[PDB]
Amino acid sequence: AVPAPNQQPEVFCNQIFINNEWHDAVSRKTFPTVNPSTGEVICQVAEGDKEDVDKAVKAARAAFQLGSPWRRMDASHRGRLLNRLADLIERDRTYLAALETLDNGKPYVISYLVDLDMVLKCLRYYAGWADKYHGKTIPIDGDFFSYTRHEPVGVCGQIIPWNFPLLMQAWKLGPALATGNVVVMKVAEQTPLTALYVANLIKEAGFPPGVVNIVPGFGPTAGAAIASHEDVDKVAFAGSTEIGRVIQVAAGSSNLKRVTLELGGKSPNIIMSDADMDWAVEQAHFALFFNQGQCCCAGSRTFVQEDIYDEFVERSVARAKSRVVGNPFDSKTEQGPQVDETQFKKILGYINTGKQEGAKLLCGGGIAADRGYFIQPTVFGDVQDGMTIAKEEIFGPVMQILKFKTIEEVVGRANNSTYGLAAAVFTKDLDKANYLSQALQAGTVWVNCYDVFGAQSPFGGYKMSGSGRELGEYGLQAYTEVKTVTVKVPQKNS
Amino acid sequence: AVPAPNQQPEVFCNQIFINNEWHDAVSRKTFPTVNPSTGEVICQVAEGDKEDVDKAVKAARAAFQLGSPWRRMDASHRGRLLNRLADLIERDRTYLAALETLDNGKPYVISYLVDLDMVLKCLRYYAGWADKYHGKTIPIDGDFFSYTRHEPVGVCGQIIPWNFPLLMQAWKLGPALATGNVVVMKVAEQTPLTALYVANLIKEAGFPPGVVNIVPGFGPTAGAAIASHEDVDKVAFAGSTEIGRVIQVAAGSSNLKRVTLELGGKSPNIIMSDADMDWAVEQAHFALFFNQGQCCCAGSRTFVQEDIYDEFVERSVARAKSRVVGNPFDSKTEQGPQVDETQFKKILGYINTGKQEGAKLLCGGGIAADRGYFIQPTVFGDVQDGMTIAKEEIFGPVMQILKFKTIEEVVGRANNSTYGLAAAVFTKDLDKANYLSQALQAGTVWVNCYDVFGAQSPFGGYKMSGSGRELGEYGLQAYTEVKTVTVKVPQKNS
Amino acid sequence: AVPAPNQQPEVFCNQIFINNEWHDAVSRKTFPTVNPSTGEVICQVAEGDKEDVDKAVKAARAAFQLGSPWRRMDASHRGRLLNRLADLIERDRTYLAALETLDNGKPYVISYLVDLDMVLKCLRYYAGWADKYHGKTIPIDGDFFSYTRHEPVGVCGQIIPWNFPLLMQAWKLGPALATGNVVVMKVAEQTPLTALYVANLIKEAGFPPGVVNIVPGFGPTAGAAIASHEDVDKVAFAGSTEIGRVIQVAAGSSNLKRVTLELGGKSPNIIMSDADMDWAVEQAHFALFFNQGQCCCAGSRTFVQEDIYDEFVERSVARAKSRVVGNPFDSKTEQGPQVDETQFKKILGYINTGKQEGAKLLCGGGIAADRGYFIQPTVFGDVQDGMTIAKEEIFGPVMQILKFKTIEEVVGRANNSTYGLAAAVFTKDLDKANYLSQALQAGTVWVNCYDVFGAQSPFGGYKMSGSGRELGEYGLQAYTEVKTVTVKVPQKNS
Amino acid sequence: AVPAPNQQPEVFCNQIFINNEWHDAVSRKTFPTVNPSTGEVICQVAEGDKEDVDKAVKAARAAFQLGSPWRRMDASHRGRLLNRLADLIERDRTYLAALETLDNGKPYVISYLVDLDMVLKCLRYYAGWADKYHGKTIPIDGDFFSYTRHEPVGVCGQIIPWNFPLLMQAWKLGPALATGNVVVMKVAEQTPLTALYVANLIKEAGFPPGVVNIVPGFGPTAGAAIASHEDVDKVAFAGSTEIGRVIQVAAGSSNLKRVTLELGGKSPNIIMSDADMDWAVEQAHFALFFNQGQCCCAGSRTFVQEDIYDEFVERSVARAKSRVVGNPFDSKTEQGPQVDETQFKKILGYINTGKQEGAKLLCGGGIAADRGYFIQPTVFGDVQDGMTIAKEEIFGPVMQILKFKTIEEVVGRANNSTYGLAAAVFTKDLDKANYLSQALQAGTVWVNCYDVFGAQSPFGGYKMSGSGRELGEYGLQAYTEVKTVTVKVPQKNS
Ligand SMILES: Nc1ncnc2c1ncn2[C@@H]1O[C@H](COP(=O)(O)OP(=O)(O)O)[C@@H](O)[C@H]1O
Ligand SMILES: Nc1ncnc2c1ncn2[C@@H]1O[C@H](COP(=O)(O)OP(=O)(O)O)[C@@H](O)[C@H]1O
Ligand code: NA
Ligand code: NA
Ligand code: NA
Ligand code: NA
């Protein structure tokens, strides 16, 4: 079951979080955060800029000083702290799920059973890594003892997007805190609220002051301030390929801070003629329409073998036509609103371009409600690789179906992209699955499934979909600085 | 192509190898080694017993002393020595393959292209591990620096069988020497010669005296002296399950030396009705008949789905009938003799049991030549799980074909065995492959192949097929002793 | 602060635990467990034997069947369950610490602050391993995809001693349950009660029935029935070297089950002349007298460099004379009774032995109280290597002080033992530390400290102190069975 | 023993190496490479620019195509090819060592015994890694089989400096080729010759055409063309911190290619009062003067405790005065010329700033010969933290000796730098070694030694000394792209 939501949850946190305290922006400015189901302002949030980020970095640097409580703390105790935080998130699960829906738009049942579940699982996974990420002892030549310490990278800037506000926070904080780093986090202007409440929980869980600092605000102000900061050791950025470029340039123009990026995708979902038809249809629908189409790794290029194309397309249309768009607090709602007006307008722009460039509009294609940012589930057929809707990330409920003949052809077409975040293969055949999974140029390849995330398995892009990995053991590599200690000994023996 | 063999290679090495020198046994007794193709004596070999083993162990212990050339040698240099040994074995490849064939009976072409190749690949793989098996630095609670050293286990007793004389030597020496151990090796009385010649090469490569010592002799004498020795730190045994028991009791009854065992099997090879028929028949032939049927992981229970049974059986009988038995130096020969008279008679015993118990004799079933230990390729059909030939390891050219209906049926019947060394699955279906590889209780599961060994991938038994793993990184564990060092420090920081 | 103890805690659990239920022995037999502070019977406990062990093994086998709740359970959820068990143990901490003291004799302040603390830390550490012990994907030669699965070893027999009842239970359950095994545990007849209570918490935590089964009873009966069982896949034993031999023999003579052993020690604690004297005296006292001397890694050979010998002895003797023996429920008490009458007598025998062979009695040497099993802290000076009290594990409050001159000498003397569990070095010198830590043949070497255990750092013996390691990542190896799956693929590419 | 050098070694390779063939630049332009001992031109070398870079990248890309010989080659065979290359460099060691000296300036004895030895060790180290860098099998939640593939990152741009021409090439090629990548290398204009000859050996070794491509030319042209190239997946740059910035900006401005950097340093060498005086003085001299002072991790800030300061400086001055500068082909020469006239002039410039700002010139200070770029071993005493010679990397034979009082003081001073490449500590004290190696913010900390490089131990910068690590297992991380494959399975079991 799912507990009944409070459909108008009280907001408690709306300021800058530095040193476990709440601060107005130095400018005293605030910006509104909007409910995308109604288009109405939820509340004002402090508008952090460069000066606020400066305060935050100083607090973070102080917390990181040798001999500080956070630096001296046992690695196992960092685990306990992460597990305490997860316990508190779970305590406030019903509230956070409802707030998540209020600010973002996603169905409450999904906030509750999916987003909040994944958040708990991620934080508890990483709690487990805290005292387990060993350095090495190394059999170097000569009369020496040589070993590596895995140290924290230090002051980590973390700039996150609005599509999974709580989950992306957890994906960042989990590996960073498990490895003893300190954080300055810039949350998305569209969805700052849940992350700020979680900051209260960080304080309650007992993290020392300055270990996690949150600065809500805009990208070119607060975000750029972090990426170009002289005393941020590392930046992790999740967002558009376009702003990823800005981040890497900022890093290089400033202090040569370490950089990881999780960017867009145009992920191919490949349906072989021997696929389980009903399963493949349902999963392709999910792969595209999940979270209002607002997923980095959305199955936005649906390649279907010619022999099953017609039936696949028929079945896909029926499912898109029966997908329930409405109030995200109604249990029956499958699809909420898009996150804001800019997104709403951009997706509608893409549907227009799709119609214009000769893609066959099979269903939807319009606005779904007269208030809030609701869009009809849209399916385009006979899509061609050169079409704008086949190339550009739409980030909306707009499905592309493309026809192919051969396994060799579809590999070339799938790989023909500057993106490489994810892909999938639907087939009953062992050799087809292995052929395709090895040939596909993508960070994750799903076989007879889609959007299967696990805290244990790494995720991240090939090509311009980003670099570095999040989740799994791999997710600790960007948060570790490696020191070699080589010691002269009287006589080295095996 | 394969170089022409010397069909009567000269024997240079036939004594006990200790401190890089050749010794008569202390009793001065010798035993004959026989050419299995003719039944004739090749030469006499020193008959090592307890006294000779005692000498060998003292030499190994001295070589292992803290501050010795072997203990002080750079880990990378152990790699250099292993690679040098591989180069010398390559230099003498034509000679060694022909000697292997003389003493063991396997086809010279197989000795050359298979055994010798796998030996080189194994030594060269482990050469690469020598300086790469790191200890750990560990984030323990409190003000401490904690780390582990991976030290050699020490003096390693290695008792090996006759079925792959050179490969079994390499499988044992590669990981032992990569990790800085010293060795007292007991070779099989049936096949002592190639391993003794390799000892000459170990000396030539530059290994310090005492690092590898070799005692040819019998099992209850030299073998048991090693297993029961008060100064041997570790024993690795490969052989029968019966002697495995003897070895583990000897270790328990002596100094609690560490034990690993590679023992027999009765490995199931499962052919689903969707398998590629031509491929499955050829691979099932190989799986069973490879090396005169003298393979620990022989596919000696061939389970075939009922819809393909008659055709599979027909094809299998034709393949067995075409199999050329003859002089192992003749390039046309596919099957040499069995290793000795004891094995010869045991295998004929098993065939007579097969017939008497109601299995269907479809081809072979008798002696194949009037000289040497040759047995016709023998196929039994309509084999039942309760039959002797379905349960006991035959270790000869005797194939069992069993009929089944369902996947759940075959899983349980395959698993209903006290052995679990290997298994194989032939199918085109992804889900059947995955279901079976998970469900099968065996150390290696091959999918659409058989007898695929890589130096990179571990190999070893479940259940009574033994314990521990050889090959890959895993092959190093049994040869490492772990030391934790925990050091008080002024102030631990992350 | 330590919560006031219930000095007469109620006993709730005194039966055989199988399938989450409490059972009498088939025989209906019960055995008294005694309070060592008073020599009085606490209560009677069900006396399990072969037939009860047979039921417990059948239940574990059932819980391990493919498709069972325990086998299908997400690894992450095994972590949640271990975490929940740690929470319940912490909830009942005050009760469990008092019950431990009642049955074992150790001071309540130590049960509470040390034993219980270490139990919680072990379980929480292994909770974190549950979903992180990865197998490997392997770049084998040829057109294959090769990988390994790390599967559970299966039905694990675990036989534990009486010196750290709750801790030894946790050391065994932690890694077995994290890796998905099932357990039949035989607890010590001297100290059954606390482990049985924890069984109640295993049920309360939500572990499926048959995952943990506990059989109280005696060694030659219940313990030997586990070791010889034909369906137990792995046995883990902690206790005497003497019984260790029996276990390895029983394993070899039965089904060749996998064995690990945690046995005795006679661990050298080396004090160099440049050591911090006050520290080294206090730590040498703790190293020996901790837990009534009943510790496998007790520093039972204290080697002191000659220039500081006289002062070190003077100070050690004053320290032993000041050690408070009495009621373990009194907060003033440093030392409680020995565990039982047998150990009491064995220690008195060793004390008389030291006097007979000429070691200098500096203090203690007698019975400390009328009731229970209390022995005076005893220090022997001028101990020589050849003496029985210098060679054999005493397991009581009996300290040996040996004098040495050189670092090279002391290495040789420290290593001249068939034991090799632990060692320590006290020195301010970098090179002396590194020289000694390298040269000492011991599973753990402490430097300027003693008895510093971390859940993160492995622990186990060299030589006749045992084999295999407990704690850390290494603790998982003995609980994992490795399966290679090697799959033919159309065309292997890097 | 060292073979007599050819002091005018012949030049065979001076063109652009693409597809295992030699090419003139598209422009037909050449640049002189100069002998720094004489100031005379050795020969002309093809001047590569963007058009030649483009030809090379297309070559690398083709060689990387799925199904090409290099992609399909067994990982173990990649290892064999690396070992073959090492064998060829060893065969040609005398020639290559003389060529290195001729083009670079370093003493022939050093080229031969140090650089060449290190090149061989690096390549043979990485040969061993080729088939051992496993991906993982991951116990993800749900009915899934999840695993990682460690794939090559792809086309690798490698831009290397002039100070260790052959070694830097090896450091780059070793890990890149072990993991199946393809390379476009830009060698330093000052030292192109040796790396070009090694390209001949790469062809001879049997590496498929296009796997390694080498473009000599200038930085703003050929190097920038590599960094900005839209089909280069990864760039690795070694050189100045200034140009490191340019690289990172170029990567984010183009295709968001993966970046690792090895930049400058101003490494502190800390001499505690309890240090071994003779050894510390010799090591501090080596630490600064190695390779004409042309070492990224040079001990260019020598901190000396005040109690030993006077003696230490006195001895350091005597040692620098006795250092032999001259013809690098003469066996008596310890120091050759600096690499070129720019470096020559820059160093004299720093010597002038040292005099101007009031540092105590103790010896040297000027040119050491009328021909070639020879500079006197120069020592400054009483150096202060604010001085230019204490802050900026000089990259010449100019030693800075600074005085300190306390361990706490020197930590702060050592860490007060935007560099963090290496540091060293000289002390006999265990606690001081541990305290310092932990507190020092440097990629490598040497204790009682300096410039101890091992192929096994990673090396790289903290802060603006760069990012990522080379050597050891860590050196493979930047050359790997991680793919997750997650497969729906019928029913997941442990
Ligand atoms: N110039 C910038 N520098 C740093 N961060 C930015 C910049 N612009 C936007 N951001 C931030 O990056 C995150 C990802 O959003 P963004 O890439 O702008 O996606 P979109 O523009 O499609 O909404 C957000 O938190 C946003 O505030
Ligand atoms: N023959 C045996 N087989 C199996 N377990 C035994 C045997 N004898 C004793 N045990 C058990 O092993 C554990 C350790 O005991 P042991 O090594 O005998 O120490 P002690 O005799 O000094 O108490 C206890 O649980 C004990 O009951
Ligand atoms: Na919003
Ligand atoms: Na023979
Ligand atoms: Na008791
Ligand atoms: Na030059």
Coordinates of C-alpha atoms in Angstrom, one line a residue, chain B residues 126-243:
Chain B
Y126 CA 51.4 -16.0 -13.9
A127 CA 54.7 -14.2 -14.7
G128 CA 52.5 -11.1 -15.1
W129 CA 50.9 -11.6 -11.6
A130 CA 54.3 -11.7 -9.8
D131 CA 54.3 -8.0 -8.8
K132 CA 50.5 -7.3 -8.9
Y133 CA 48.9 -9.2 -6.0
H134 CA 48.6 -6.3 -3.6
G135 CA 47.8 -6.3 0.1
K136 CA 45.5 -3.6 1.5
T137 CA 45.6 -0.5 3.6
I138 CA 42.6 -0.5 5.9
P139 CA 40.6 2.3 7.6
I140 CA 40.4 0.6 11.0
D141 CA 38.7 2.4 14.0
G142 CA 40.9 4.6 16.3
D143 CA 44.3 6.0 16.0
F144 CA 46.0 3.3 13.9
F145 CA 47.5 2.6 10.5
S146 CA 46.4 -0.9 9.6
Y147 CA 47.6 -2.8 6.5
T148 CA 48.1 -6.3 5.1
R149 CA 51.1 -8.0 3.6
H150 CA 50.5 -10.8 1.1
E151 CA 53.4 -13.1 2.0
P152 CA 54.1 -16.5 0.5
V153 CA 52.6 -19.5 2.2
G154 CA 56.1 -21.0 2.3
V155 CA 57.1 -24.6 1.5
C156 CA 54.5 -26.0 -0.9
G157 CA 54.0 -29.7 -1.4
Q158 CA 52.6 -30.3 -4.9
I159 CA 51.4 -33.8 -5.9
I160 CA 50.3 -34.1 -9.5
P161 CA 48.7 -36.8 -11.8
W162 CA 49.6 -38.3 -15.2
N163 CA 46.9 -37.1 -17.5
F164 CA 48.4 -33.8 -18.5
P165 CA 52.0 -34.1 -17.1
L166 CA 53.4 -30.8 -18.4
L167 CA 50.3 -28.7 -18.0
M168 CA 49.6 -29.9 -14.5
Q169 CA 53.2 -29.0 -13.6
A170 CA 52.7 -25.5 -15.1
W171 CA 49.3 -25.1 -13.3
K172 CA 51.1 -25.7 -10.1
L173 CA 54.4 -23.9 -10.6
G174 CA 53.0 -20.7 -12.2
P175 CA 51.0 -19.3 -9.1
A176 CA 53.4 -20.8 -6.5
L177 CA 56.4 -19.2 -8.0
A178 CA 54.7 -15.9 -9.0
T179 CA 53.9 -15.5 -5.3
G180 CA 57.4 -16.3 -4.0
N181 CA 56.9 -19.8 -2.7
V182 CA 59.2 -22.8 -2.8
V183 CA 58.1 -26.2 -4.1
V184 CA 58.6 -29.9 -3.4
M185 CA 56.8 -31.5 -6.3
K186 CA 55.8 -35.2 -6.6
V187 CA 55.2 -36.3 -10.2
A188 CA 53.2 -39.3 -11.3
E189 CA 55.0 -42.6 -11.7
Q190 CA 53.3 -43.1 -15.0
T191 CA 54.7 -39.9 -16.4
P192 CA 57.7 -38.5 -14.6
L193 CA 60.0 -37.6 -17.6
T194 CA 58.8 -34.3 -19.0
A195 CA 58.6 -32.7 -15.6
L196 CA 62.2 -33.8 -14.8
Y197 CA 63.4 -32.2 -18.1
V198 CA 61.5 -29.0 -17.2
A199 CA 63.6 -29.0 -13.9
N200 CA 66.8 -28.8 -16.1
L201 CA 65.1 -25.7 -17.6
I202 CA 64.2 -24.2 -14.2
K203 CA 67.9 -24.4 -13.3
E204 CA 68.9 -22.9 -16.8
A205 CA 66.3 -20.0 -16.4
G206 CA 68.2 -19.0 -13.2
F207 CA 65.9 -20.0 -10.3
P208 CA 67.9 -20.2 -7.0
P209 CA 68.6 -23.7 -5.8
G210 CA 66.0 -25.2 -3.5
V211 CA 63.2 -23.1 -5.1
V212 CA 61.8 -26.0 -7.1
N213 CA 62.5 -29.6 -6.0
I214 CA 61.1 -32.7 -7.7
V215 CA 60.8 -36.2 -6.3
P216 CA 59.6 -38.9 -8.7
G217 CA 58.4 -41.9 -6.7
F218 CA 55.1 -43.7 -5.8
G219 CA 52.1 -42.3 -4.0
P220 CA 52.0 -44.2 -0.7
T221 CA 55.7 -43.5 -0.3
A222 CA 56.8 -40.1 -1.7
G223 CA 53.3 -38.6 -2.0
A224 CA 52.4 -39.4 1.6
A225 CA 55.8 -38.3 2.9
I226 CA 54.9 -34.8 1.5
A227 CA 51.3 -34.8 2.8
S228 CA 52.4 -35.9 6.3
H229 CA 55.5 -33.7 6.5
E230 CA 56.0 -31.6 9.6
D231 CA 57.7 -28.8 7.7
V232 CA 55.5 -28.5 4.6
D233 CA 53.2 -25.5 4.9
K234 CA 50.8 -26.2 2.1
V235 CA 49.8 -29.1 0.0
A236 CA 48.0 -29.0 -3.4
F237 CA 46.8 -32.4 -4.6
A238 CA 45.4 -33.3 -8.0
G239 CA 44.1 -36.9 -8.5
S240 CA 41.4 -39.3 -7.5
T241 CA 38.8 -38.3 -4.9
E242 CA 39.9 -41.4 -2.9
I243 CA 43.5 -40.1 -2.4

